[PDB]
A paper describes a structure:
The major histocompatibility complex class I–related ([name]) protein captures and presents small organic molecules to an innate-like T cell population called mucosal-associated invariant T ([name]) cells.
Lumichrome was sequestered within the [name] aromatic cradle where its isoalloxazine ring sat in a perpendicular orientation to that of the other RF catabolites. This lumichrome ring orientation is similar to the potent [name] upregulators Ac-6-FP and 6-FP, ruling out that the downregulation observed with lumichrome is due to changes in lumichrome docking inside [name]. Here, the flavin ring of the lumichrome ligand was sandwiched between [name]-Tyr7, Tyr62, Trp69, and Trp156, while the 2-carbonyl moiety formed H-bonds with [name]-Arg94, water-mediated H-bonds with [name]-Gln153, and VDW interactions with [name]-Arg9. Also, the 4-carbonyl moiety formed a direct H-bond with [name]-Trp156. Surprisingly, a unique [name]–Lys43–flavin ring linkage flavin bond was observed between the 7-methyl group of the lumichrome ring and [name]-Lys43. As lumichrome was unable to refold with the MR1R9H mutant, [name]–Arg9–lumichrome interaction is most likely essential for the ligand stabilization and [name] downregulation. Here, we define a previously uncharacterized form of flavination in a nonenzymatic protein comprising the Lys-43 of [name] covalently linked to C7 of the isoalloxazine ring. Notably, lumichrome binding does not induce ER egress but rather ER retention and thus is distinguished from those ligands that form a Schiff base. Overall, our data suggest that the direct interactions of RF catabolites with [name] in the cells lead to the reduction of cell surface expression where lumichrome is the most potent downregulator followed by alloxazine, lumiflavin, and then FMF.
Numbering used by the authors:
A (entry chain B): 1 to 97
B (entry chain G): 2 to 200
C (entry chain A): 0 to 189, 196 to 270
D (entry chain H): 1 to 244
């Protein structure tokens, strides 16, 4: 069976405009393991983006955490973009704060 | 980490022998027993990893993890059981630690002891005189020579399969002028009824 | 202590795209990765500093050899499964083994396998037998159960060795694994009440909404426990507000032996 | 169906000389091992190979190296022989490793003696002694004795041949050799064997008895500078005929 990834985008701390923070994109429950993730800033692809090693769940699916340091402002919109074998096209999830 | 077993054990044919193996290890993934006949390769006898006794023909193997000890139990002993028995333990990293081995010596049941010392015939190609101590009971031990020019071998068990007949023997030889079979085994404690044929 | 666990996973892939490893194995203590190995590095490496600092090089070298051997065995096993399924293309094989030391002192132990992310074989260490999900697994089950000693070995490793490894690693990483960081909890309005916790360690946390004292399981929306990225976690749970009758709603959070209540006035 | 095949069976070496021991297994095993066995202690791992394409040191790696040539073969190299490498070497294999349950399958063993100087290698002198007439009349059995004496190192195989066929029934050979001079670390050795037959078998004048000792010693490339004959690998024997 193939399992499509669950995508959640959130900040490390409660966001406050002007206060430095970390944008997280936690991608879980997918199978098989090949996957492609990007953090977006205003629809552009952020360059310096870290991620954990591929992780394993008891139910045999996988999970990953992609993140980047940032300072949230009122205007800039932030997103996570995921591609997987289960997806016809990339799936974009915006940071709803 | 260390593993300990007795150096050597002696039992009588037809009886039962228990060979012990104690081990101190960090971690435990199993205990193996191996049989090694003299001059030959060890071969797998048994494996224990949970507690208790497992039987396999005449051999049984026992394990107590909490005591860190195992024994190999051999019943109805036969001469072909003469061998070294090697105990080995798999430690927490799946590395084998080997005991030094236990040499099992089996005493044949001699049905009609007839102890005697015979002089063999000289060979024209050798200066040695040769004496054979033979047919004695298995409780008799053969001592090494006290004279540096006298050679005495340890006792050997021979099987005449056609007659289903076993016998102990030891050989002594020398080329000294004063050497005689009547005194060849004078350093051994030999049966009082030992037959010494007239020279 | 609290409950702790030790688990090792293996992933094997039959026809991996270029770059992606054929084989990967990762160990975990609770949610923390502790060790990793793959077919590209061919080396076992720590994934937690307190593992690196407490295990001499002879340990990393020994399991590097063992892992290279396990990688080849895993390839052979995946090859046989995909022949017996008569399957083309790329397929995955997975294994999970480990144990739990519970707070009450009792222990559990598990070992299981998956093919294409679905249960394939499950070990039962009390009946010393394998549960097969289909007839390819049943063929493998017959061969594994014919070697009774290998079953006994797994029982011993799960009940004794794994628990001893877990206690040893729990001591190594005790400053991490045995600490408590209490949650910061608030209630926001979005209509629905959202109860949000963050900043907490360990990750195990129970959040729920009460209405007038009774619970409302079918009405609560539970969010996942999520890594913040700094070693702590966050979570939430929402409840949909009734606009036709007032009710006393309260959020209830339990973490590491402490219960909290946030009444929404 | 061969199991584990290792060579050579016996080897003598001068200090400083090189040697490669061969090992092959036809069992389709993945794990292979080289052990040394010495008196008074357990087997010690020298090197091992958990799987094709990887090898690593054991407990006593110094002075040795290994090559896992393929799935089947695992060779042990001594590059500069030292007297402390005098030992019996055993190659072994197992289906896998890092499983707890699997036993090892051992090769036949390689007996290596390393010497500072080959000047104390000797073949055995072999003599056969005919049965005692007193024994024949007292027991109706006849014991022949073969003595193999003065050889060094203890690299011999003694066999008995009756009417041109090797025999084992009725035979007992000392399991351990006798040090002719017990106090010396390089003492030459003695070995005895008995063959016991019925008196009626001994008393047939057409029956032929022979004791043969195969000695494993020097070879063509070994340098020899003593006045006596070069102690090469050879067979030494002695015979007797039945006596009416
Ligand atoms: C470092 C490591 C060790 C390990 N040990 C295992 C063991 O002893 N038994 C198993 O069945 N599986 C194991 N897997 C591993 C994996 C890793 C990475
Ligand atoms: Cl992809």
């Amino acid at each position: 069976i193939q399992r499509t990834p669950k995508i959640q985008v959130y900040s490390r701390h409660p966001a406050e405009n002007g206060k430095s923070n970390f944008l997280n994109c936690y991608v879980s429950g997918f199978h098989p393991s090949d996957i492609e993730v990007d953090l977006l800033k205003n629809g552009e692809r952020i360059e310096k983006v870290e991620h954990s090693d591929l992780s394993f769940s008891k139910d045999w699916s996988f999970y990953l955490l992609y993140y980047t340091e940032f300072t949230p402002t009122e205007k800039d919109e932030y997103a996570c973009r995921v591609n997987h074998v289960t997806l016809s096209q990339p799936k974009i999830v915006k940071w709803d704060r | 980490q260390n593993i300990d077993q007795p150096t050597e054990m002696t039992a009588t044919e037809g009886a039962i022998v228990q060979i012990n193996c104690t081990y101190q290890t960090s971690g435990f993934n199993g205990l193996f027993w191996y049989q090694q006949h003299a001059g030959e390769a060890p071969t797998f006898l048994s494996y224990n990893v949970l507690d208790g006794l497992e039987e396999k023909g005449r051999f049984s193997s026992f394990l107590s993890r909490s005591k860190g000890y195992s024994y190999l139990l051999l019943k109805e002993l036969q001469m072909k059981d003469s061998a070294s028995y090697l105990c080995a333990v798999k430690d927490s990293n799946y590395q084998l630690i080997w005991g030094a081995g236990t040499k099992l010596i089996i005493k044949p049941d001699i049905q009609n002891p007839d102890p005697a010392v015979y002089q063999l015939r000289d060979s024209k190609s050798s200066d040695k005189s040769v004496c054979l101590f033979t047919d004695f009971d298995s409780q008799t031990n053969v001592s090494q020579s006290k004279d540096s020019d006298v050679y005495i071998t340890d006792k050997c068990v021979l099987d005449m399969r056609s007659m289903d007949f076993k016998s102990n023997s030891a050989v002594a030889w020398s080329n000294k002028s004063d050497f005689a079979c009547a005194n060849a085994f004078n350093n051994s404690i030999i049966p009082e009824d030992t037959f010494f044929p007239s020279p | 202590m609290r409950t702790h666990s030790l688990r090792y996973f293996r992933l094997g892939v039959s026809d991996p795209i270029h770059g992606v490893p054929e084989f990967i194995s990762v160990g975990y203590v609770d949610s923390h990765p502790i060790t990793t190995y793959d077919s590209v590095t061919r080396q076992k490496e720590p994934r937690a500093p307190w593992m690196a600092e407490n295990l001499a090089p002879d340990h990393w070298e020994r399991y590097t050899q063992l892992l290279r051997g396990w990688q080849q065995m895993f390839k052979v096993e995946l090859k046989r499964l995909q022949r017996h399924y008569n399957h083309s293309g790329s397929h995955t094989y997975q294994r999970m083994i480990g144990c739990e030391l519970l707070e009450d002192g009792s222990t559990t132990g598990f070992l299981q396998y998956a093919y294409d992310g679905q249960d394939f074989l499950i070990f039962n260490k009390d009946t010393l037998s394998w549960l097969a999900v289909d007839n390819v697994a049943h063929t493998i089950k017959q061969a594994w159960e014919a070697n009774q000693h290998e079953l006994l070995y797994q029982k011993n490793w799960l009940e004794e060795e794994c628990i001893a490894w877990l206690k040893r690693f729990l001591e190594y990483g005790k400053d991490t694994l045995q600490r408590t960081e209490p949650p910061l909890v608030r209630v926001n309005r979005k209509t629905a009440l959202f109860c949000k916790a963050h900043g907490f360690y360990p990750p195990e946390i129970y959040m729920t909404w009460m209405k007038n004292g009774e619970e409302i399981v079918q009405e609560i929306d539970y969010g996942d426990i999520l890594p913040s990225g700094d070693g702590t976690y966050q979570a939430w749970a929402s409840i949909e507000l009734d606009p036709q009758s007032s009710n006393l709603y309260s959020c209830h959070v339990e973490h590491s032996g402490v219960h909290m209540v946030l009444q929404v006035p | 169906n061969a199991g584990v095949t290792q060579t050579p069976k016996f080897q003598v070496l001068k200090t400083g000389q090189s040697m490669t021991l061969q090992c092959a297994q036809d069992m389709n095993h993945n794990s292979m091992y080289w052990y040394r066995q010495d008196p008074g202690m357990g087997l010690r791992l020298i090197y091992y190979s958990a799987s094709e394409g990887t090898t690593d040191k054991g407990e006593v790696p110094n002075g040795y190296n290994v090559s896992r040539l393929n799935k089947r073969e695992f060779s042990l190299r001594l590059e500069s022989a030292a007297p402390s490498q005098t030992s019996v070497y055993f190659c072994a294999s197992s289906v896998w490793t890092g499983e707890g349950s699997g036993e090892l399958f051992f090769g036949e063993g390689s007996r290596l003696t390393v010497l500072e100087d080959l000047k104390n290698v000797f073949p055995p002198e072999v003599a056969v002694f005919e049965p005692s007439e007193a024994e024949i009349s007292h027991t109706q059995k006849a014991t022949l004795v073969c003595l193999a004496t003065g050889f060094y190192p203890d690299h011999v195989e003694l066999s008995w041949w009756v009417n041109g066929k090797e025999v084992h029934s009725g035979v007992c050979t000392d399991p351990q050799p006798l040090k002719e001079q017990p106090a010396l670390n390089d003492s030459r050795y003695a070995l005895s064997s008995r063959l016991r037959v019925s008196a009626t078998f001994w008393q047939n004048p057409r029956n032929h008895f022979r004791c043969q000792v195969q000695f494993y010693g020097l070879s063509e490339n070994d340098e020899w500078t003593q006045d006596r004959a070069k102690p090469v690998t050879q067979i030494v024997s002695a015979e007797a005929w039945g006596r009416a």
